Copies of this chain bind each other. A is one copy, B any other.
């Protein structure tokens, strides 16, 4: 949830919707099974793309475009 600190400020100062209170109360747990991530883009879908690691044994070189262009030109 990107709006993490905002919810904390709202509850401390008063107000906030039911979702903010729920996330605040369920986030206070100090357990390793719950992870807290905050940021302007870390919680967004964009940051999730780069988090995926490449396999150790899977080849990393890209040779698909070469095959496609070879097929297009020669064939």
The reply to whether B66 and A25 contact each other, CB–CB distance below 8 Å, is no
Of the residues B26, B29, B30, B74, contact of A25 by C-beta under 8 Å: B74
Q: How many copies does the complex hold?
A: 2
From A28, which residue of chain B is reached at the shortest CB distance?
B70
- Nearest-Cβ distance from residue A27 to partner chain B, whole angstroms: 11
- A73 adjacent to chain B (CB < 8 Å): yes
- Nearest-Cβ distance from residue A39 to partner chain B, whole angstroms: 26
Chain A 2-32 interface residues, beta-carbon cutoff 8 Å to B: 22, 25-26, 29-30
The reply to whether B66 and A30 contact each other, CB–CB distance below 8 Å, is yes
Residues of A that sit less than 8 Å from B by CB: 22, 25-26, 29-30, 63, 66, 70, 73-74
